[PDB]
Amino acid sequence: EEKEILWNEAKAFIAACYQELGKAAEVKDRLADIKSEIDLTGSYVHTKEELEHGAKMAWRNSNRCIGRLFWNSLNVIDRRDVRTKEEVRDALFHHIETATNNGKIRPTITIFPPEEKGEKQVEIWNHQLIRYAGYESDGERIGDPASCSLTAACEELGWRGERTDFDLLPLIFRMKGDEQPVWYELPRSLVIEVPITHPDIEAFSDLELKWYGVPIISDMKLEVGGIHYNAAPFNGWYMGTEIGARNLADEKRYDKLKKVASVIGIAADYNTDLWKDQALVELNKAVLHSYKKQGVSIVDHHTAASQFKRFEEQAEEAGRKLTGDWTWLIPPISPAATHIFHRSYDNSIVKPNYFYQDKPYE
Amino acid sequence: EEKEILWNEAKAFIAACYQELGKAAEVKDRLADIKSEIDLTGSYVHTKEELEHGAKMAWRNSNRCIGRLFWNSLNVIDRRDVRTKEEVRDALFHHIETATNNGKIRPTITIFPPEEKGEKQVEIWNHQLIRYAGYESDGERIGDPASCSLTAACEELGWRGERTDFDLLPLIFRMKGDEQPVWYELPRSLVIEVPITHPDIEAFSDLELKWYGVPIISDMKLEVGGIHYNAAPFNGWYMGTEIGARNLADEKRYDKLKKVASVIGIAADYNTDLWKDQALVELNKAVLHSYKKQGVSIVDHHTAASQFKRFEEQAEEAGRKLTGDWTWLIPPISPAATHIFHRSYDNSIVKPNYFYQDKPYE
Numbered sequence: 001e002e003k004e005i006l007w008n009e010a011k012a013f014i015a016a017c018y019q020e021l022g023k024a025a026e027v028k029d030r031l032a033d034i035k036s037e038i039d040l041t042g043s044y045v046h047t048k049e050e051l052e053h054g055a056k057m058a059w060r061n062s063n064r065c066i067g068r069l070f071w072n073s074l075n076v077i078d079r080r081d082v083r084t085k086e087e088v089r090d091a092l093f094h095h096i097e098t099a100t101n102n103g104k105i106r107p108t109i110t111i112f113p114p115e116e117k118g119e120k121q122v123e124i125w126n127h128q129l130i131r132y133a134g135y136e137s138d139g140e141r142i143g144d145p146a147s148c149s150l151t152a153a154c155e156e157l158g159w160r161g162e163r164t165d166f167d168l169l170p171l172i173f174r175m176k177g178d179e180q181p182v183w184y185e186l187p188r189s190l191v192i193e194v195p196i197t198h199p200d201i202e203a204f205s206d207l208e209l210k211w212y213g214v215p216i217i218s219d220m221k222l223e224v225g226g227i228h229y230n231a232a233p234f235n236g237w238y239m240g241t242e243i244g245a246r247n248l249a250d251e252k253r254y255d256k257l258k259k260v261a262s263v264i265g266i267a268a269d270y271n272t273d274l275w276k277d278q279a280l281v282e283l284n285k286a287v288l289h290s291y292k293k294q295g296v297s298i299v300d301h302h303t304a305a306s307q308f309k310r311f312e313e314q315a316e317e318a319g320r321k322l323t324g325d326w327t328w329l330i331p332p333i334s335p336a337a338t339h340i341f342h343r344s345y346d347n348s349i350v351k352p353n354y355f356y357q358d359k360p361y362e
Numbered sequence: 363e364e365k366e367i368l369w370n371e372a373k374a375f376i377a378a379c380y381q382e383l384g385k386a387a388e389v390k391d392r393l394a395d396i397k398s399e400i401d402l403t404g405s406y407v408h409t410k411e412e413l414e415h416g417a418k419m420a421w422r423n424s425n426r427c428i429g430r431l432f433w434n435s436l437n438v439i440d441r442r443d444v445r446t447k448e449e450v451r452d453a454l455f456h457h458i459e460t461a462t463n464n465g466k467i468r469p470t471i472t473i474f475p476p477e478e479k480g481e482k483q484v485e486i487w488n489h490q491l492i493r494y495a496g497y498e499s500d501g502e503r504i505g506d507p508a509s510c511s512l513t514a515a516c517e518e519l520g521w522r523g524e525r526t527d528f529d530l531l532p533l534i535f536r537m538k539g540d541e542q543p544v545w546y547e548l549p550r551s552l553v554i555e556v557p558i559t560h561p562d563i564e565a566f567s568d569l570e571l572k573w574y575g576v577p578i579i580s581d582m583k584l585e586v587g588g589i590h591y592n593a594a595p596f597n598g599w600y601m602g603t604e605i606g607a608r609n610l611a612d613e614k615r616y617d618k619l620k621k622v623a624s625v626i627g628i629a630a631d632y633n634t635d636l637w638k639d640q641a642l643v644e645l646n647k648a649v650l651h652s653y654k655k656q657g658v659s660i661v662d663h664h665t666a667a668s669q670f671k672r673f674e675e676q677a678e679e680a681g682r683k684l685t686g687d688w689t690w691l692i693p694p695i696s697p698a699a700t701h702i703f704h705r706s707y708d709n710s711i712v713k714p715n716y717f718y719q720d721k722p723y724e
């Protein structure tokens with residue numbers, strides 16, 4: 001059954017991919033080769049063209065992503081050749097450097113060897129390549145609560161954080177054959193961060209907020225034509241609300257709205273004053289201002305929604321069905337100010353795609 | 363088939379209703395009577411207790427309503443006795459008066475005779491009993507665009523609006539046997555309105571905004587135990603975002619965000635300034651302030667979400683399944699500041715319930 005699933009996924013992908021690339025005549029010969037290869041080895045190897053276009057198709061098919069207009073300009077780095085933990089580490093360092101691009105962020109994915117028999121070759125423990133640690137001991141909360149379990153796992157392995165609110169977690173991953181993951185501290189010269197200030201309110205800097213420049217998701221599996229690339233970190237640039245309305249505002253994250261209310265000079269006492277709403281707007285204005293001033297790529301939710309409208313239009317013009325998850329596509333502030341709010345979306349799963357997977361810790 | 367559907371819906375409703383009322387022993391005798399009544403007449407008549415509890419159950423089951431904590435205190439007015447258009451008109455006037463209650467709004471439903479053979483006895487044309495007219499002629503837009511088609515239908519019938527931005531539409535309804543609906547102007551003494559001012563920004567009154575006090579939905583069908591009450595207007599009090607983030611802000615409604623930005627002294631030129639978001643917050647603060655100052659009932663979205671949390675808790679304690687539509691329950695500003703955003707809801711339809719229906723015009 002294993003191999004039949006593979007063959008069926010392969011047929012569908014190759015036909016679709018080659019059609020999009022204007023290579024439809026080469027499909028039969030390619031499929032023949034693949035069938036024989038599956039016959040002998042139990043799997044098949046993507047050409048560099050297939051792998052690159054597959055990762056792009058996967059982004060295009062990601063229902064929860066508002067940023068998909070730019071799917072075709074994804075920078076795909078093929079690292080299926082890595083075999084050592086130093087090579088993995090260096091590939092991850094390289095991804096950070098080339099994606100960051102001195103602040104002019106390049107959407108990039110680095111693809112490591114795929115699962116073989118469901119056997120991972122490389123298992124990345126980080127949720128993002130750059131993320132802050134979190135601690136909760138004896139009532140006392142420090143850093144990003146979303147990182148508490150991973151932070152504890154790292155500290156079991158001999159890492160120790162300084163216990164600021166913004167400790168960078170080390171890269172941590174396990175190779176096939178190793179019982180334990182290895183970890184490596186991130187070189188600070190590779191990691192751009194942005195201090196959060198407000199365009200008009202000088203006191204905003206008293207909050208001493210900052211965030212990292214580049215979100216590099218490293219716990220999803222890329223599936224292309226039945227091949228499962230469990231290790232394939234990818235990044236875009238942030239939409240400002242991710243930082244200002246979720247990471248810094250959620251009560252189960254940095255929980256900063258009361259502090260923001262205080263520095264902008266409004267009371268945080270009455271629901272009817274809409275102080276949370278006002279604080280959200282100023283925090284989100286500060287985030288966009290701060291990234292722009294530093295020269296680090298970022299998009300606001302209005303511009304992002306306008307770009308997504310164009311993606312919708314482009315899909316229709318290309319004769320491709322559009323899929324989407326309305327609940328994730330609406331921004332978490334002013335959603336009804338976007339066209340997305342007033343439309344519906346088919347949340348069907350189309351492959352290639354990116355899929356969430358279990359974390360070894362918990 | 364008609365009658366079998368009726369009987370099946372009846373059995374389910376009576377058993378559930380009588381169980382909730384502690385009358386479970388009376389179910390068999392009541393069902394016997396109902397079966398005979400369906401046998402002879404083709405339908406059955408609800409007791410006043412059944413009708414009242416049915417309308418309450420219908421509110422409790424309304425997946426899209428955040429206000430359901432208060433389902434059991436619905437004021438149910440039984441007007442199944444009306445036969446004339448003057449009696450309907452007077453019942454609607456009465457609903458407005460008693461629901462308004464000098465500003466201390468009472469959630470109320472008035473129930474008119476049900477459909478017989480799918481034959482309506484009373485057909486209300488209004489979407490809400492109180493709503494503003496809308497006009498679009500030769501490029502020129504006045505009033506509420508959502509009311510354009512109904513406004514045009516009224517004017518076909520000899521009504522004429524003054525063409526302010528806030529003309530009250532007449533009550534308009536048709537009786538069984540009449541080709542044309544009749545209309546009646548609303549007595550202004552019955553209709554509370556609130557001028558919109560801002561707590562801190564004096565210039566806000568230059569926008570000359572106002573809204574009506576009580577939303578009285580009059581185009582949904584109440585279905586209880588297989589009986590279809592197509593005419594059964596009901597009201598609550600507003601959640602402020604309905605007025606400030608939808609009615610006054612939507613581009614296809616009053617479209618006031620650019621004007622709000624101007625009076626609060628911010629530019630409306632750059633998406634990254636989040637001027638729409640800032641304008642939304644101030645407009646919504648003004649709405650809540652203005653209703654509160656006048657002594658007209660209103661709820662903010664934070665308090666509303668907290669009440670809904672209690673409804674969720676109450677359902678669990680009662681052993682009742684909770685149903686909900688996440689896409690309507692999240693407020694249209696700061697949705698992620700509410701617990702609703704972070705939970706999921708089963709959007710199954712449970713009866714009794716309220717259902718949308720076709721409007722005779724278009």
Ligand code: HEM
Pocket residue numbers: 055058059062064065066067068070074107108109220234235236237238239242299304328354356
């Ligand atoms: C170029 C700039 C990009 C922007 C502004 C953007 C924007 C976003 C946003 C706002 C989300 C939702 C996160 C949330 O609301 O909690 C998201 C989700 C997602 N994006 Fe994008 N994105 C970008 C690039 C990419 C790229 C390059 C890929 C992959 C090649 C990608 C794949 C996804 C996926 C898979 C999700 C869902 C993640 C999950 O389920 O946890 N995006 N994106």
Ligand code: HEM
Pocket residue numbers: 417420421424426427428429430432436469470471582596597598599600601604661666690716718
């Ligand atoms: C007591 C105060 C009430 C509040 C604050 C409230 C709040 C709301 C809100 C905000 C909506 C969504 C409208 C939108 O977002 O576009 C809604 C929908 C709804 N409410 Fe309530 N509600 C209340 C009372 C009632 C009552 C008394 C009933 C019926 C007996 C009711 C039945 C419904 C129904 C059926 C809908 C869906 C309407 C549709 O599909 O168009 N609500 N409610």
Ligand SMILES: Cc1cc(N)nc(CCc2cc(C#N)cc(CCc3cc(C)cc(N)n3)c2)c1
Pocket residue numbers: 215217234235236237238239242247356
């Ligand atoms: C349990 C579970 C299931 C599932 N499917 N997804 C998740 C994580 C959702 C998510 C959270 C964060 C955060 N913080 C960032 C993200 C990444 C958002 C993103 C991704 C990219 C590539 C760019 C960009 N601007 N933003 C996603 C958890």
Ligand SMILES: Cc1cc(N)nc(CCc2cc(C#N)cc(CCc3cc(C)cc(N)n3)c2)c1
Pocket residue numbers: 577579596597598599600601604609718
């Ligand atoms: C095509 C279509 C289908 C469908 N199911 N519903 C609709 C109308 C949705 C709606 C719009 C408005 C408005 N304006 C007010 C409402 C009423 C909201 C409400 C109702 C009540 C009783 C109280 C309260 N505070 N708010 C609903 C259109």
Ligand SMILES: C[C@H](O)[C@H](O)[C@H]1CNc2nc(N)[nH]c(=O)c2N1
Pocket residue numbers: 340341342343344689690691692
């Ligand atoms: C159907 C379409 O998604 C539309 O925007 C829905 C979304 N959610 C909503 N939620 C509420 N509360 N009210 C609405 O009118 C809508 N409209």
Ligand SMILES: C[C@H](O)[C@H](O)[C@H]1CNc2nc(N)[nH]c(=O)c2N1
Pocket residue numbers: 327328329330702703704705706
């Ligand atoms: C699952 C639950 O409804 C949760 O709040 C979802 C809602 N929509 C979302 N939308 C985005 N963009 N990001 C998220 O993390 C979530 N979480």
Ligand SMILES: [Cl-]
Pocket residue numbers: 215242247
């Ligand atoms: Cl993030």
Ligand SMILES: [Cl-]
Pocket residue numbers: 577604609
């Ligand atoms: Cl309304």
